[PDB]
């Protein structure tokens, strides 16, 4: 069996209209069950153009392809959204707050639509620690800059923390899917999530920096010793909010560089373009597998 | 004054790749592209920032193709006309912080001088009429302190988030000259979440009451806060650190004491969003007349 999407907010049922402002969708203008009722896989990532390329790629893999892929979030440019069969693809911009806004409105969307048995997967990019560039990491545990699996949020002025573990069975399944493709290195490790790409990640190439190469190396190697294999900027809220609503979720990111060797992203454009298809291919394999059952 | 960085590592680099702009010192001529920039205007939405650069062109008599300088990426958009640069920054502290780091280095590479940085945005008001414009006197955290906190190599650091006082008063005068919409100077609270982070009852998560919301928002008002958004604190912190003259100008889309949902008709909201554009348009026109 597969359970209905639940909220942790009793106010929503008591509203006569729910406006999904950042999607330009509303319960009074759109039929959510008709539009989204059959959704089973929701994939999210930073870049709208990557999330569109993803929907097209998955359409081909599941035999839906010919055709046009309309942006469901016409009426806004905050996020883009696409659908083919049971697969929904949504962009989320960059950063904890940007993906958090998307998650609130998306979980409400799935709830209004009465979706059931859903899986949510982030596909993204990151910096690796001690891994060859282009390696894919499947996140076991999302982790803060001090290495603790917690997400802190200020609510009405008070600090609140939620656990940021991810579903273990899902990560092992994702690892098997990657083994089946046999196309690129894929590890499971912890993922550090930060609020800043530059100083927040120990970079020396920001507009501000008051530390040395030695300080960076020491911090990064300490992170590695604590089991961290990559660094990005969304994993923490994603995990916390999915945990909060009882949703099975996973995070799959390609590394664009090895941070023990540098800060700048200088690989040729063709190499980066291909690196970024790796998570798509992995998740594509996962979805195809699930559908042949 | 020339734009300055607080990072000694930059000077010794062979090339500087501005990854999220898809710009690089070795593929792009920064002095030739941006050397004459004096006014940098930043906002969340790529559409709004494009409309802004068009509006500005007309008001300064440049008016008709306006190329996205950041073709090659879709992370941010960027437009230029004369001494005015229009840049989008997405939503949230980390999104605008990535943008700022790279924008400030860009201005340094172009060796721009006497620049002004202004965020034109949207926000939720507290105790103000929807459509009111707020000029940020001081950016403040969700406990109403003028501090921005960042974790660097695992350690907590804080910077002050005051904004240039002569600039806020100059902007107030520009709005008075327009005479088109209510404009107040007040404090602006910056949060890391739009829903629970701002005391909304309409998120996917909410374990508090309408009454809890009211008393939090009213305490905020009592501490001099007039609007709520998601960028002001880092913006002020980084500009302060680099010695840049900066301001924050946001229209209010609703009064949060009356509600959480943004339910005004599309046409009203579009007109609201032009208000900060027009004010900043006034400011630029005057700086250029003098
Ligand atoms: O360029 C930074 C983006 O890549 C991975 C993330 O988590 C950020 O959104
Ligand atoms: O819709 C939320 C956006 O409006 C103002 C901000 O600061 C956010 O980026
Ligand atoms: O080093 C990196 C690369 C991509 N995304 C990140 O957040 N960090
Ligand atoms: O209420 C609001 C409206 C726009 N932007 C915000 O951060 N809050």
XYZ file of N, CA and C in Angstrom, chain A residues 47-287:
723
model
N 18.602 24.291 -11.191
C 18.497 24.987 -12.476
C 17.271 24.586 -13.297
N 16.460 25.574 -13.694
C 15.254 25.300 -14.477
C 15.579 24.583 -15.789
N 16.651 24.983 -16.461
C 17.008 24.355 -17.729
C 17.491 22.913 -17.549
N 18.184 22.631 -16.448
C 18.547 21.252 -16.134
C 17.310 20.414 -15.798
N 16.360 20.998 -15.065
C 15.153 20.264 -14.701
C 14.245 20.031 -15.914
N 14.344 20.894 -16.917
C 13.630 20.646 -18.165
C 14.324 19.556 -18.982
N 15.647 19.638 -19.086
C 16.399 18.600 -19.777
C 16.133 17.246 -19.116
N 15.954 17.257 -17.801
C 15.673 16.025 -17.086
C 14.329 15.418 -17.460
N 13.281 16.241 -17.515
C 11.957 15.728 -17.867
C 11.947 15.130 -19.279
N 12.678 15.752 -20.200
C 12.784 15.247 -21.565
C 13.523 13.919 -21.590
N 14.602 13.838 -20.822
C 15.383 12.619 -20.758
C 14.549 11.477 -20.191
N 13.801 11.753 -19.132
C 12.980 10.720 -18.514
C 11.795 10.339 -19.409
N 11.280 11.299 -20.173
C 10.224 11.002 -21.137
C 10.701 9.985 -22.177
N 11.924 10.158 -22.660
C 12.489 9.217 -23.616
C 12.675 7.826 -23.014
N 13.149 7.778 -21.775
C 13.442 6.509 -21.121
C 12.198 5.687 -20.807
N 11.072 6.358 -20.602
C 9.836 5.675 -20.249
C 8.886 5.569 -21.446
N 9.393 5.875 -22.635
C 8.625 5.713 -23.857
C 7.476 6.683 -24.071
N 7.480 7.796 -23.344
C 6.449 8.822 -23.510
C 6.772 9.768 -24.663
N 8.045 9.818 -25.044
C 8.541 10.828 -25.980
C 8.060 10.648 -27.423
N 8.151 11.724 -28.205
C 7.782 11.709 -29.620
C 9.016 11.777 -30.510
N 7.430 16.335 -29.445
C 6.462 16.706 -28.417
C 6.937 17.919 -27.622
N 6.006 18.557 -26.922
C 6.319 19.756 -26.151
C 6.219 19.520 -24.643
N 7.091 20.186 -23.891
C 7.099 20.066 -22.439
C 6.840 21.422 -21.798
N 5.563 21.738 -21.578
C 5.132 23.051 -21.100
C 5.594 23.308 -19.668
N 6.031 24.536 -19.405
C 6.325 24.967 -18.048
C 5.020 25.202 -17.303
N 4.754 24.372 -16.305
C 3.510 24.448 -15.552
C 3.411 25.749 -14.740
N 4.568 26.296 -14.366
C 4.640 27.547 -13.616
C 4.764 28.760 -14.518
N 4.098 28.739 -15.669
C 3.945 29.962 -16.444
C 3.117 30.904 -15.579
N 3.427 32.189 -15.617
C 2.796 33.120 -14.703
C 3.775 33.549 -13.627
N 4.937 32.899 -13.594
C 5.987 33.253 -12.647
C 7.353 32.819 -13.175
N 8.415 33.470 -12.706
C 9.766 33.003 -12.999
C 10.578 32.634 -11.749
N 9.902 32.397 -10.627
C 10.595 31.976 -9.408
C 11.083 30.529 -9.528
N 10.219 29.667 -10.045
C 10.532 28.256 -10.200
C 9.915 27.760 -11.503
N 10.493 26.709 -12.083
C 9.877 26.036 -13.228
C 9.413 24.628 -12.838
N 8.409 24.113 -13.544
C 7.813 22.821 -13.198
C 7.338 22.071 -14.448
N 7.663 20.782 -14.531
C 7.302 19.966 -15.683
C 6.773 18.598 -15.245
N 5.929 17.988 -16.075
C 5.346 16.684 -15.753
C 5.227 15.763 -16.967
N 5.646 14.515 -16.788
C 5.390 13.465 -17.764
C 5.009 12.201 -17.019
N 3.803 11.706 -17.264
C 3.312 10.557 -16.528
C 3.366 10.801 -15.029
N 3.946 9.860 -14.273
C 4.009 9.932 -12.809
C 5.221 10.722 -12.319
N 5.943 11.366 -13.229
C 7.133 12.117 -12.849
C 6.921 13.631 -12.909
N 7.164 14.297 -11.782
C 7.159 15.749 -11.722
C 8.583 16.264 -11.511
N 8.947 17.296 -12.264
C 10.278 17.889 -12.176
C 10.155 19.369 -11.819
N 10.819 19.798 -10.747
C 10.691 21.179 -10.268
C 12.064 21.796 -9.958
N 12.279 23.048 -10.359
C 13.503 23.748 -9.978
C 13.308 24.417 -8.611
N 14.406 24.734 -7.934
C 14.311 25.289 -6.585
C 15.294 26.423 -6.294
N 16.055 26.840 -7.301
C 17.011 27.921 -7.116
C 18.165 27.493 -6.231
N 18.873 28.443 -5.636
C 20.019 28.078 -4.807
C 19.852 28.529 -3.362
N 20.073 27.619 -2.414
C 20.078 27.975 -1.006
C 18.929 27.410 -0.183
N 19.185 27.208 1.108
C 18.168 26.703 2.035
C 16.811 27.452 1.958
N 16.823 28.793 2.026
C 15.544 29.516 1.922
C 14.840 29.319 0.577
N 15.582 29.306 -0.529
C 14.950 29.148 -1.837
C 14.290 27.773 -1.993
N 14.982 26.717 -1.591
C 14.389 25.392 -1.679
C 13.292 25.192 -0.622
N 13.450 25.816 0.543
C 12.413 25.750 1.574
C 11.069 26.314 1.095
N 11.091 27.454 0.406
C 9.851 28.034 -0.128
C 9.226 27.040 -1.096
N 10.046 26.519 -1.989
C 9.561 25.521 -2.917
C 8.950 24.303 -2.197
N 9.611 23.807 -1.155
C 9.117 22.612 -0.468
C 7.753 22.807 0.195
N 7.556 23.952 0.847
C 6.269 24.237 1.483
C 5.139 24.187 0.465
N 5.323 24.889 -0.648
C 4.282 24.988 -1.662
C 4.129 23.686 -2.441
N 5.209 22.925 -2.546
C 5.154 21.664 -3.264
C 4.465 20.570 -2.435
N 4.787 20.505 -1.149
C 4.134 19.541 -0.273
C 2.634 19.840 -0.160
N 2.273 21.120 -0.139
C 0.859 21.490 -0.186
C 0.219 21.073 -1.515
N 0.937 21.277 -2.617
C 0.459 20.830 -3.927
C 0.136 19.322 -3.946
N 1.067 18.507 -3.465
C 0.873 17.060 -3.423
C -0.295 16.672 -2.511
N -0.448 17.407 -1.414
C -1.537 17.163 -0.482
C -2.902 17.518 -1.090
N -2.989 18.685 -1.720
C -4.215 19.087 -2.402
C -4.576 18.083 -3.495
N -3.557 17.553 -4.165
C -3.764 16.621 -5.272
C -4.110 15.205 -4.800
N -3.968 14.955 -3.497
C -4.199 13.636 -2.903
C -3.248 12.580 -3.459
N -1.994 12.964 -3.675
C -0.987 12.029 -4.144
C -0.715 11.001 -3.056
N -0.222 9.829 -3.447
C 0.102 8.776 -2.485
C 1.308 7.965 -2.943
N 2.042 7.416 -1.982
C 3.227 6.634 -2.286
C 4.296 7.394 -3.050
N 4.507 8.650 -2.670
C 5.448 9.516 -3.371
C 6.897 9.352 -2.883
N 7.843 9.527 -3.799
C 9.255 9.612 -3.449
C 9.786 10.963 -3.920
N 10.503 11.663 -3.047
C 11.128 12.940 -3.396
C 12.636 12.789 -3.468
N 13.230 13.234 -4.573
C 14.670 13.131 -4.760
C 15.287 14.434 -5.250
N 16.270 14.933 -4.518
C 17.043 16.055 -5.005
C 18.162 15.570 -5.924
N 18.251 16.163 -7.110
C 19.394 15.939 -7.984
C 20.134 17.261 -8.171
N 21.405 17.294 -7.780
C 22.146 18.541 -7.760
C 23.636 18.441 -8.019
N 24.340 19.521 -7.705
C 25.784 19.568 -7.845
C 26.387 19.919 -6.494
N 27.672 19.643 -6.335
C 28.322 19.867 -5.060
C 29.817 19.923 -5.253
N 30.531 20.269 -4.188
C 31.970 20.121 -4.160
C 32.321 18.833 -3.428
N 33.258 18.062 -3.976
C 33.685 16.834 -3.334
C 34.857 17.034 -2.388
N 35.008 16.119 -1.440
C 36.191 16.093 -0.592
C 36.867 14.729 -0.739
N 38.072 14.728 -1.307
C 38.839 13.507 -1.496
C 38.238 12.517 -2.477
N 37.509 13.027 -3.468
C 36.902 12.205 -4.507
C 37.291 12.769 -5.866
N 37.457 11.909 -6.863
C 37.737 12.411 -8.194
C 36.525 13.209 -8.693
N 36.777 14.317 -9.403
C 35.690 15.135 -9.958
C 34.769 14.295 -10.844
N 33.471 14.569 -10.789
C 32.497 13.773 -11.509
C 31.938 12.598 -10.720
N 32.477 12.344 -9.528
C 31.922 11.297 -8.666
C 30.538 11.705 -8.183
N 29.622 10.752 -8.100
C 28.302 11.024 -7.551
C 28.224 10.577 -6.087
N 27.645 11.415 -5.230
C 27.470 11.058 -3.826
C 25.994 10.857 -3.522
N 25.663 9.735 -2.895
C 24.316 9.532 -2.382
C 24.350 9.818 -0.891
N 23.637 10.860 -0.476
C 23.705 11.344 0.894
C 23.064 10.389 1.894
N 23.838 9.955 2.877
C 23.290 9.125 3.945
C 22.671 10.031 4.991
N 23.408 11.074 5.342
C 23.004 11.979 6.393
C 23.390 13.381 5.954
N 22.448 14.317 6.027
C 22.779 15.715 5.807
C 23.313 16.292 7.113
N 24.258 17.216 7.003
C 25.052 17.630 8.144
C 25.373 19.135 8.113
N 25.350 19.786 9.273
C 25.625 21.219 9.329
C 27.139 21.490 9.303
N 27.543 22.771 9.264
C 28.972 23.093 9.134
C 29.822 22.662 10.329
N 29.192 22.168 11.392
C 29.921 21.647 12.548
C 29.845 20.124 12.566
N 29.184 19.627 11.569
C 29.101 18.192 11.313
C 27.961 17.489 12.055
N 27.105 18.219 12.523
C 25.972 17.645 13.256
C 24.759 17.473 12.347
N 24.108 16.302 12.406
C 22.927 16.063 11.567
C 21.690 16.780 12.096
N 21.712 18.111 12.111
C 20.585 18.891 12.608
C 20.303 20.065 11.692
N 19.032 20.418 11.553
C 18.664 21.640 10.857
C 18.051 22.627 11.844
N 18.687 23.785 11.989
C 18.216 24.823 12.896
C 17.358 25.850 12.161
N 16.245 26.219 12.778
C 15.370 27.237 12.226
C 14.808 28.123 13.333
N 14.675 29.417 13.058
C 14.115 30.340 14.046
C 12.628 30.576 13.781
N 11.795 30.199 14.749
C 10.349 30.274 14.620
C 9.795 31.190 15.712
N 9.171 32.290 15.302
C 8.686 33.305 16.236
C 9.784 33.729 17.212
N 11.022 33.779 16.730
C 12.131 34.238 17.544
C 12.849 33.166 18.347
N 12.326 31.941 18.340
C 12.928 30.835 19.094
C 13.606 29.820 18.176
N 14.762 29.317 18.597
C 15.465 28.278 17.850
C 14.779 26.921 17.947
N 14.624 26.264 16.804
C 14.098 24.903 16.731
C 15.023 24.045 15.871
N 15.223 22.789 16.260
C 16.076 21.899 15.483
C 15.332 20.630 15.086
N 15.610 20.148 13.877
C 15.038 18.896 13.400
C 16.160 17.987 12.914
N 15.955 16.682 13.040
C 16.944 15.721 12.585
C 16.978 15.657 11.056
N 18.166 15.447 10.494
C 18.333 15.474 9.047
C 18.860 14.167 8.456
N 18.436 13.039 9.022
C 18.766 11.734 8.457
C 17.928 11.478 7.212
N 18.455 10.648 6.315
C 17.712 10.202 5.145
C 17.439 8.697 5.183
N 16.378 8.289 4.495
C 15.938 6.898 4.442
C 17.068 5.974 3.974
N 17.487 5.061 4.849
C 18.602 4.144 4.585
C 18.341 3.137 3.473
N 17.116 2.644 3.411
C 16.766 1.651 2.413
C 16.835 2.292 1.032
N 16.334 3.519 0.929
C 16.381 4.258 -0.324
C 17.825 4.472 -0.805
N 18.748 4.790 0.102
C 20.110 5.036 -0.366
C 20.778 3.765 -0.885
N 20.502 2.623 -0.251
C 21.070 1.362 -0.719
C 20.493 0.985 -2.082
N 19.202 1.225 -2.252
C 18.552 1.016 -3.533
C 19.190 1.887 -4.621
N 19.404 3.161 -4.310
C 20.023 4.092 -5.250
C 21.437 3.645 -5.617
N 22.167 3.126 -4.634
C 23.501 2.586 -4.877
C 23.466 1.401 -5.849
N 22.483 0.516 -5.689
C 22.315 -0.619 -6.610
C 21.975 -0.158 -8.024
N 21.138 0.871 -8.131
C 20.802 1.423 -9.437
C 22.056 1.928 -10.132
N 22.922 2.600 -9.384
C 24.150 3.125 -9.970
C 25.090 1.998 -10.401
N 25.137 0.926 -9.613
C 25.933 -0.242 -9.968
C 25.444 -0.836 -11.285
N 24.129 -0.816 -11.489
C 23.536 -1.362 -12.707
C 23.924 -0.580 -13.966
N 24.032 0.743 -13.859
C 24.470 1.561 -14.995
C 25.948 1.346 -15.316
N 26.783 1.315 -14.281
C 28.211 1.103 -14.445
C 28.924 2.190 -15.233
N 28.507 3.444 -15.050
C 28.985 4.543 -15.892
C 29.923 5.545 -15.200
N 29.869 5.612 -13.872
C 30.673 6.584 -13.136
C 30.733 6.185 -11.664
N 31.756 6.663 -10.940
C 31.938 6.312 -9.526
C 30.821 6.907 -8.672
N 30.290 6.124 -7.743
C 29.215 6.591 -6.886
C 29.440 6.048 -5.487
N 29.489 6.939 -4.501
C 29.663 6.512 -3.121
C 28.496 6.966 -2.264
N 28.305 6.304 -1.132
C 27.438 6.887 -0.130
C 28.287 7.508 0.969
N 27.932 8.731 1.350
C 28.661 9.460 2.370
C 27.773 10.537 2.945
N 28.278 11.262 3.933
C 27.534 12.388 4.460
C 27.752 13.646 3.628
N 26.783 14.550 3.706
C 26.789 15.771 2.926
C 26.662 16.994 3.834
N 27.619 17.913 3.733
C 27.584 19.136 4.524
C 26.854 20.239 3.777
N 25.921 20.883 4.456
C 25.072 21.881 3.830
C 25.401 23.234 4.443
N 25.619 24.246 3.608
C 26.062 25.555 4.099
C 25.213 26.697 3.563
N 25.280 27.841 4.245
C 24.535 29.032 3.849
C 25.337 29.965 2.930
N 26.601 29.637 2.703
C 27.455 30.463 1.860
C 28.384 29.575 1.042
N 28.506 29.891 -0.242
C 29.286 29.107 -1.197
C 30.788 29.377 -1.063
N 31.133 30.575 -0.594
C 32.530 31.015 -0.543
C 33.203 30.856 0.828
N 33.037 31.829 1.718
C 33.528 31.678 3.094
C 32.820 30.532 3.813
N 31.537 30.349 3.525
C 30.781 29.264 4.120
C 31.293 27.878 3.744
N 32.125 27.783 2.705
C 32.670 26.483 2.307
C 34.203 26.441 2.307
N 34.822 27.417 2.955
C 36.266 27.435 3.082
C 37.018 27.856 1.834
N 36.328 28.484 0.881
C 36.979 28.963 -0.346
C 37.922 30.151 -0.112
N 38.950 30.262 -0.949
C 39.871 31.393 -0.876
C 39.586 32.419 -1.970
N 38.577 32.161 -2.802
C 38.333 33.018 -3.960
C 37.063 33.868 -3.871
N 36.620 34.175 -2.655
C 35.459 35.030 -2.474
C 35.842 36.502 -2.480
N 34.850 37.382 -2.351
C 35.115 38.809 -2.206
C 35.656 39.097 -0.812
N 35.405 38.174 0.114
C 35.906 38.279 1.484
C 36.568 36.969 1.879
N 37.686 37.056 2.599
C 38.385 35.875 3.106
C 39.461 36.276 4.108
N 39.335 35.821 5.349
C 40.332 36.153 6.363
C 41.123 34.937 6.861
N 41.262 33.916 6.025
C 41.992 32.720 6.430
C 42.936 32.221 5.334
N 43.713 31.192 5.654
C 44.739 30.692 4.741
C 44.414 29.325 4.130
N 45.175 28.969 3.101
C 45.126 27.648 2.497
C 45.241 26.563 3.561
N 46.135 26.775 4.518
C 46.335 25.814 5.595
C 45.081 25.633 6.446
N 44.381 26.733 6.718
C 43.164 26.682 7.525
C 42.068 25.902 6.790
N 41.948 26.161 5.491
C 40.985 25.481 4.631
C 41.211 23.974 4.622
N 42.463 23.569 4.406
C 42.832 22.157 4.316
C 42.511 21.429 5.615
N 42.799 22.095 6.724
C 42.568 21.524 8.039
C 41.078 21.314 8.294
N 40.266 22.293 7.901
C 38.821 22.191 8.079
C 38.215 21.105 7.187
N 38.605 21.104 5.914
C 38.140 20.114 4.944
C 38.544 18.673 5.301
N 39.770 18.486 5.771
C 40.215 17.147 6.155
C 39.521 16.683 7.438
N 39.266 17.612 8.356
C 38.430 17.307 9.511
C 37.020 16.868 9.091
N 36.433 17.567 8.121
C 35.116 17.186 7.615
C 35.147 15.772 7.048
N 36.196 15.471 6.289
C 36.345 14.152 5.690
C 36.460 13.049 6.751
N 37.174 13.341 7.834
C 37.355 12.379 8.918
C 36.029 12.091 9.614
N 35.139 13.074 9.609
C 33.820 12.906 10.198
C 32.854 12.226 9.224
N 33.360 11.807 8.067
C 32.556 11.039 7.130
C 31.913 11.861 6.020
N 32.293 13.128 5.920
C 31.723 13.987 4.895
C 32.435 13.799 3.558
N 31.667 13.613 2.492
C 32.261 13.396 1.175
C 31.940 14.521 0.191
N 30.913 15.314 0.486
C 30.616 16.459 -0.373
C 29.952 17.624 0.352
N 29.830 18.736 -0.360
C 29.393 19.989 0.218
C 28.451 20.690 -0.742
N 27.251 21.011 -0.276
C 26.314 21.793 -1.066
C 25.449 22.691 -0.177
N 24.269 23.068 -0.650
C 23.529 24.131 0.017
C 22.014 23.899 0.194
N 21.539 22.668 0.021
C 20.106 22.400 0.197
C 19.764 21.178 1.046
N 20.717 20.265 1.204
C 20.443 18.956 1.785
C 19.756 18.997 3.147
N 20.137 19.950 3.992
C 19.598 20.034 5.353
C 18.093 20.305 5.465
N 17.592 21.382 4.849
C 16.144 21.634 4.914
C 15.361 20.537 4.234
N 15.874 20.096 3.089
C 15.223 19.058 2.302
C 14.956 17.849 3.209
N 15.999 17.369 3.882
C 15.872 16.222 4.775
C 14.907 16.500 5.922
N 15.050 17.660 6.563
C 14.247 17.983 7.735
C 12.758 18.072 7.415
N 12.422 18.731 6.310
C 11.018 18.893 5.929
C 10.392 17.596 5.439
N 11.155 16.790 4.707
C 10.650 15.485 4.285
C 10.425 14.562 5.494
N 11.378 14.540 6.424
C 11.223 13.800 7.675
C 9.974 14.247 8.432
N 9.801 15.560 8.553
C 8.655 16.135 9.248
C 7.311 15.658 8.686
N 7.214 15.519 7.366
C 5.948 15.109 6.759
C 5.861 13.613 6.444
N 6.851 12.841 6.881
C 6.840 11.407 6.637
C 7.042 10.997 5.183
N 7.784 11.802 4.424
C 8.031 11.501 3.014
C 9.375 10.816 2.805
N 9.367 9.726 2.050
C 10.598 9.051 1.659
C 11.369 9.974 0.724
N 12.617 10.280 1.070
C 13.398 11.236 0.285
C 14.874 10.861 0.159
N 15.526 11.392 -0.873
C 16.943 11.125 -1.097
C 17.649 12.305 -1.763
N 18.961 12.373 -1.576
C 19.770 13.418 -2.177
C 20.921 12.800 -2.976
N 20.968 13.131 -4.261
C 21.952 12.584 -5.191
C 22.623 13.743 -5.929
N 23.907 13.963 -5.655
C 24.642 15.087 -6.247
C 25.955 14.645 -6.884
N 26.264 15.203 -8.052
C 27.576 15.011 -8.663
C 28.563 16.033 -8.077
N 29.830 15.646 -7.923
C 30.858 16.605 -7.517
C 31.483 17.262 -8.745
N 31.624 18.584 -8.707
C 32.145 19.324 -9.861
C 33.653 19.541 -9.762
N 34.198 19.360 -8.560
C 35.632 19.482 -8.325
C 35.991 18.782 -7.019
N 37.280 18.526 -6.825
C 37.789 18.043 -5.551
C 38.345 19.246 -4.800
N 37.682 19.598 -3.705
C 37.989 20.807 -2.952
C 39.332 20.758 -2.215
N 39.898 19.569 -2.046
C 41.232 19.485 -1.456
C 42.276 19.998 -2.453
N 41.877 20.119 -3.720
C 42.789 20.523 -4.789
C 42.523 21.935 -5.315
N 41.351 22.489 -5.014
C 41.023 23.817 -5.499
C 39.667 24.364 -5.083
N 39.407 25.601 -5.503
C 38.172 26.309 -5.196
C 37.390 26.652 -6.467
N 38.103 26.987 -7.536
C 37.453 27.488 -8.746
C 36.956 26.338 -9.609
N 35.876 26.577 -10.340
C 35.289 25.552 -11.193
C 35.695 25.769 -12.650
N 36.772 25.101 -13.055
C 37.467 25.411 -14.306
C 37.424 24.315 -15.372
N 36.747 23.210 -15.086
C 36.574 22.172 -16.090
C 35.896 22.761 -17.320
N 36.244 22.254 -18.508
C 35.588 22.684 -19.750
C 34.070 22.541 -19.659
N 33.348 23.409 -20.355
C 31.891 23.400 -20.329
C 31.279 22.044 -20.696
N 31.904 21.341 -21.631
C 31.387 20.053 -22.076
C 31.513 19.005 -20.972
N 32.591 19.093 -20.199
C 32.807 18.177 -19.092
C 31.777 18.397 -17.976
N 31.507 19.659 -17.643
C 30.528 19.985 -16.605
C 29.117 19.598 -17.035
N 28.812 19.822 -18.305
C 27.514 19.453 -18.837
C 27.278 17.955 -18.667
N 28.307 17.162 -18.946
C 28.195 15.714 -18.818
C 28.158 15.261 -17.346
N 28.974 15.879 -16.498
C 28.938 15.579 -15.069
C 27.510 15.726 -14.550
N 26.829 16.774 -14.998
C 25.496 17.089 -14.508
C 24.401 16.143 -14.999
N 24.701 15.335 -16.011
C 23.740 14.350 -16.490
C 23.786 13.079 -15.649
N 24.874 12.896 -14.910
C 25.059 11.662 -14.145
C 23.945 11.414 -13.109
N 23.625 12.418 -12.277
C 22.511 12.231 -11.339
C 21.177 11.958 -12.054
N 20.948 12.599 -13.196
C 19.742 12.340 -13.979
C 19.664 10.880 -14.406
N 20.793 10.349 -14.860
C 20.839 8.984 -15.352
C 20.603 8.003 -14.213
N 21.221 8.270 -13.071
C 21.007 7.447 -11.891
C 19.528 7.417 -11.510
N 18.919 8.590 -11.368
C 17.524 8.656 -10.947
C 16.602 8.067 -12.007
N 16.939 8.287 -13.278
C 16.222 7.662 -14.373
C 16.183 6.149 -14.245
N 17.324 5.553 -13.923
C 17.404 4.107 -13.734
C 16.519 3.653 -12.563
N 16.570 4.396 -11.457
C 15.731 4.132 -10.285
C 14.243 4.134 -10.614
N 13.818 5.114 -11.394
C 12.407 5.261 -11.708
C 11.937 4.146 -12.635
